């Protein structure tokens, strides 16, 4: 409890440069940047709430970007960063290198930004948390933040399609992974780690599409399932509309994306016979997992020790 008092008595002497983060170690984003899934994944993997937006050279910091700004962003839209910065237009908080931490804190208290640029040769950036970690004499962290300013230290966003059999937007795959890991116990984390689930979803020929042709509208090729015909594979619609004819009387209803079928085919029921038929009414794009594949994924999860 003496470290806090020490730091308090020493704040009038220490300047921003004593706790400054060199410009070489700053996490920046160019203003001429688009918020496609890859850029947003790179933004989030750093776990930095406030990121400076620079135009041209890195020393030219022109705006700010808050992770809280990425709420209504759809990575599918691939919106440009300029539109977001214009809608929000965060205020720049400037400071000089020859400043005392007392004045720094006085500014941050009512300041429009807890992140400030230290300069007009820009050297780096200082945040309220730096000042307070220096005062308290003990470092801080919300574990989302990567490391504690000493070059020493979660799911990597590696859900990107790079020219494979079928094309789906990374945001779609992410929603798939989330929905399966959450609302289906067969793919729950407790039974199968998320990394293994992701490997399984992007496994070749698992995710597949299907084109609709009025000619063969009721052909056996467009039937993902047939009543009282055994199968061994689990389906999860990603895009499209399907007609489910269920029950012994054959009640017909419609189902769109994120409607899964035949979970028991994967786990032990032994045999799985669905009392329903799933026909395609449009272009379908879905996941198809075989019992063998699910068992292999479980083998993977139990093999890592």
Pairwise CA distance, residues 128 & 138, whole Å: 14
Q: Which does 113 bind (CB under 5 to 8 A by kind): ligand ANP, a copy of itself, Mg ion, none?
A: a copy of itself
Establish if 76 lies at the interface with Mg ion (CB under 5 A): yes
Establish if 29 lies at the interface with a copy of itself (CB under 8 A): no
Q: Which two three-digit tokens encode residue 207? A: 């995710």
Nearest-5° angle of CA 238, CA 242, CA 247? 125
Residue number, 73 or 255, with CB nearest to ligand ANP:
73
Q: Which two three-digit tokens encode residue 219? A: 């052909």
Choices 19-27, 186-194, 237-245, 283-291; region in contact with ligand ANP by CB under 6 A: 19-27
Q: Which does 130 bind (CB under 5 to 8 A by kind): a copy of itself, Mg ion, ligand ANP, none?
A: ligand ANP
Establish if 49 lies at the interface with a copy of itself (CB under 8 A): yes
Q: How far is the CB of 106 from a copy of itself (least distance, A)?
A: 8
- HEC string of 55-100 equals CCCCCCEEEEEEHHHHCCCCCCCCEEHHHHHHHHCCCCCEECCCCE
238 touches 257 (CB < 8 A): yes
Q: Residue 302: beta bridge partners? A: none
Q: Compose the 248-277 pattern: x for residues touching ligand ANP by CB under 6 A, - for all others.
A: ------------------------------
Helix or strand (DSSP H, E) at 278: strand 276-280
What does residue 87 show for φ and ψ, rounded to 5 degrees? -60, -40
Residue number, 50 or 291, with CB nearest to a copy of itself:
50
Establish if 42 lies at the interface with Mg ion (CB under 5 A): no
* Residues between 120 and 159 with contacts to a copy of itself, criterion CB under 8 A: 128, 132, 135-136, 138-144, 154, 156-157
Cα 305 to Cα 1, 297, 301: the distances in Å are: 42, 15, 9
Torsion of CA 25, 124, 133, 70, to 10 degrees: -70
Establish if 233 lies at the interface with ligand ANP (CB under 6 A): no
Residue number, 1 or 214, with CB nearest to a copy of itself:
1
Q: How far is the CB of 139 from a copy of itself (least distance, A)?
A: 6
Cα 148 to Cα 139, 144, 236: the distances in Å are: 7, 11, 42
Q: Which two three-digit tokens encode residue 149? A: 């300013």
User: What is the contact surface with a copy of itself in residues (CB under 8 A)?
Assistant: 1-2, 4-5, 7-9, 11-12, 37, 40, 43-44, 47, 49, 66-68, 70-77, 79, 82-84, 86-87, 102, 105, 108-114, 128, 132, 135-136, 138-144, 154, 156-157, 167, 171, 174-175, 178-179, 181-183, 254
User: What is the contact surface with Mg ion in residues (CB under 5 A)?
Assistant: 74, 76, 142
User: What is the contact surface with ligand ANP in residues (CB under 6 A)?
Assistant: 21, 26-27, 48-52, 115, 125, 127-130, 142-143, 145, 149
């Amino acid at each position: 409890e003496l470290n806090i008092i020490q730091g308090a008595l020493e704040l009038r002497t220490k300047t921003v440069e004593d706790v400054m983060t060199p410009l070489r170690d700053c996490f920046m984003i160019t203003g001429e940047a688009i918020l496609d899934f890859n850029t947003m994944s790179e933004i989030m993997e750093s776990g930095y709430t406030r990121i400076p937006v620079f135009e041209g050279e890195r020393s030219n910091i022109v705006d700010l970007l808050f992770v809280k700004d990425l709420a209504f962003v759809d990575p599918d839209d691939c919106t440009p960063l300029k539109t977001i910065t214009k809608f929000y237009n965060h205020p720049l908080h400037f400071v000089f290198n020859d400043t005392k931490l007392d004045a720094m804190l006085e500014e941050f208290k009512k300041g429009k930004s807890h992140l400030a640029i230290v300069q007009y040769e820009v050297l780096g950036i200082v945040t309220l948390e730096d000042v307070i970690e220096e005062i308290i004499k003990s470092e801080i962290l919300d574990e989302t933040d990567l490391y504690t300013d000493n070059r020493t230290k979660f799911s990597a966003f590696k859900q990107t399609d790079s020219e494979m059999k079928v094309k789906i937007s990374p945001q779609l795959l992410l929603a798939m992974h989330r929905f399966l890991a959450t609302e289906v116990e067969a793919f729950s984390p407790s039974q199968m780690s998320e990394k293994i689930l992701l490997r399984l979803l992007k496994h070749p020929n698992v995710i597949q599409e299907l084109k609709y042709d009025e000619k063969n509208k009721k052909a056996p090729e467009y039937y993902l399932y047939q009543r009282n015909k055994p199968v061994d594979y689990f389906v999860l619609i990603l895009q499209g509309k399907v007609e489910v004819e269920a029950g012994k009387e054959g009640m017909k209803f419609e189902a769109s994306a994120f409607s899964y079928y035949g979970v028991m085919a994967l786990t032990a029921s032994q045999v799985y016979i669905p009392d329903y038929s799933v026909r395609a009414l449009s272009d379908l794009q879905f996941v198809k997992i075989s019992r063998q594949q699910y068992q292999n994924a479980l083998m993977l999860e139990h093999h890592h020790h």
